[PDB]
Every structure is written in structure tokens, then in C-alpha cells.
Write a protein that binds this ligand. Structure first.
Ligand SMILES: NC(=O)c1ccc[n+]([C@@H]2O[C@H](COP(=O)([O-])OP(=O)(O)OC[C@H]3O[C@@H](n4cnc5c(N)ncnc54)[C@H](OP(=O)(O)O)[C@@H]3O)[C@@H](O)[C@H]2O)c1
Ligand SMILES: Nc1nc(=O)c2nc(CNc3ccc(C(=O)N[C@@H](CCC(=O)O)C(=O)O)cc3)cnc2[nH]1
Ligand SMILES: [Mn+2]
Ligand SMILES: [Mn+2]
Ligand SMILES: [Mn+2]
Length: 159
């Protein structure tokens, strides 16, 4: 099973200048809980944005060019990325925009955080078709001293 996990600001913005400008510790904790002990697939730009391997997860990087770091696994196509995960129950695709576009048709589940923040961005989460997806979990949180915007955790499953 393939799942996508992402945090979206207003208008589906996910990034600006290869960075995420907001800081929401509760959402990073949600990201860790839902990805730990699973393989994670990311594109090369997202690898450069994170800047280090994510511990406790098999890190798989998509790039057309040879890898430059043997602490992670480098693959050259979507099919190779999936194969490199082996026989696991759930593969987590962690972006960025171009990678989400390619894996969305193959995904059964979306883990989305909707952040109430207006962000100038240059990268967006793909338009998906709402009729194809059923919301099976949602949890709203007001802003607090640690998290400066309100946010909604949602899990959607392909109908
Ligand atoms: N808010 C969130 O949830 C979230 C999550 C992830 C990322 N982001 C943000 O998203 C932005 C990065 O997204 P992006 O769309 O620019 O880049 P991306 O999807 O991270 O990376 C694209 C790169 O991945 C490689 N790639 C993708 N598909 C491939 C394929 N089929 N075969 C081989 N290589 C492939 C290529 O690398 P080569 O050029 O080396 O071939 C391509 O240039 C940043 O702003 C980051 O902060 C946000
Ligand atoms: N909901 C969501 N939020 C994100 O921030 C996010 N980020 C990415 C890609 N970028 C990043 C950037 C930083 C870390 C990171 O530092 N993660 C730590 C945080 C642990 C914690 O804060 O408790 C990790 O070990 O996962 C992960 C992914 C992909 N999907 C996402 N999905
Ligand atoms: Mn092929
Ligand atoms: Mn197999
Ligand atoms: Mn806000």
C-alpha cells in the first residue's frame, strides 16, 4: 500500500524556495509518528531541504543522476523506488510536489495536515479529485503557545 503524507497551507501551498517557512511542532510530531519504522520516498529537492537522513526509516531518494551519499538509497524511477521498499505493509511518500504528482494515482491513503496560514509559495500539492476520497479521521486544533496557527489532521482513503 502506498500513502502520501503532506502539510498544506492555504491554496495547497507546500513550499517556497525549497523550504517550509512555517514552524508547527505538533505537525512534525504527527509526521514522525506516522512515518517511523516505514520506508519513506522523497525527491532530490526534498532530500536537500531536509538535509540529513531521517532516523528509524529507510530513506529512498528519487533522482535521475547518481547518488552522492551512501547513508540513503538512490533510485532512478518510480517502479525502482517501490521495489526498493520490499514487502512492507505501507510505503510513505513524503514529497515534494513533482513526486506527489507521480504517486497520487497509485496511493490508497492520504495523511494531510491543513494549516490555517497564508503562504507565498512556489510548490503546490496536486489537485486531487474529492469524489475519489473518503475522510476516515479528522482532528482540529486551535493555535497555542507552541503552534502559531490552527491546523487540522485528516486521513483520507481512496473509495
Ligand atoms: N509541506 C510538505 O508537506 C512538503 C513535503 C515535501 C516537500 N515540501 C517542499 O516541496 C518542495 C520540493 O518539491 P519539488 O516539487 O521542487 O521537488 P521534489 O519532488 O522533492 O524533487 C524533484 C526531483 O526528484 C527527482 N525525481 C522526481 N521524480 C523522478 C523520477 N520519476 N525519476 C527520477 N527522478 C525523479 C528529480 O531529481 P533530479 O533533478 O536529480 O533528477 C526531480 O528534480 C520544497 O519547497 C520542500 O520544502 C513540502
Ligand atoms: N504533515 C507533514 N508535515 C511536514 O512537516 C512534512 N514535511 C515533509 C518533508 N520535510 C520534512 C522536514 C523536516 C522533518 C523532520 O525534521 N522530522 C523529524 C521531526 C520529529 C519531531 O519533530 O517530533 C522526524 O524525525 O521525522 C521531516 C520532513 C513531508 N511531509 C510532511 N508532512
Ligand atoms: Mn521503468
Ligand atoms: Mn514483493
Ligand atoms: Mn494562521
Amino acid at each position: 500500500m502506498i500513502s502520501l503524507i503532506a502539510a498544506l497551507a492555504v491554496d495547497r501551498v507546500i513550499g517556497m524556495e525549497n523550504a517550509m517557512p512555517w514552524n508547527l511542532p505538533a505537525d512534525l510530531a504527527w509526521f514522525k509518528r506516522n512515518t517511523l519504522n516505514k520506508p519513506v520516498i522523497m525527491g532530490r529537492h526534498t532530500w536537500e531541504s531536509i538535509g540529513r537522513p531521517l532516523p528509524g526509516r529507510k530513506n529512498i531518494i528519487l533522482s535521475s543522476q547518481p547518488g552522492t551519499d551512501d547513508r540513503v538509497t538512490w533510485v532512478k524511477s518510480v517502479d525502482e523506488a517501490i521495489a526498493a521498499c520490499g514487502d512492507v505493509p505501507e510505503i510513505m511518500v513524503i514529497g515534494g510536489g513533482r513526486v506527489y504528482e507521480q504517486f497520487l494515482p497509485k496511493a490508497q491513503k492520504l495523511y494531510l495536515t491543513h494549516i490555517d496560514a497564508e503562504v507565498e509559495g512556489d510548490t503546490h500539492f496536486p489537485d486531487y479529485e474529492p469524489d475519489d476520497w473518503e475522510s476516515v479521521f479528522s482532528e482540529f486544533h486551535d493555535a497555542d503557545a507552541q503552534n502559531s496557527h490552527s491546523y487540522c489532521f485528516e486521513i483520507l482513503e481512496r473509495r
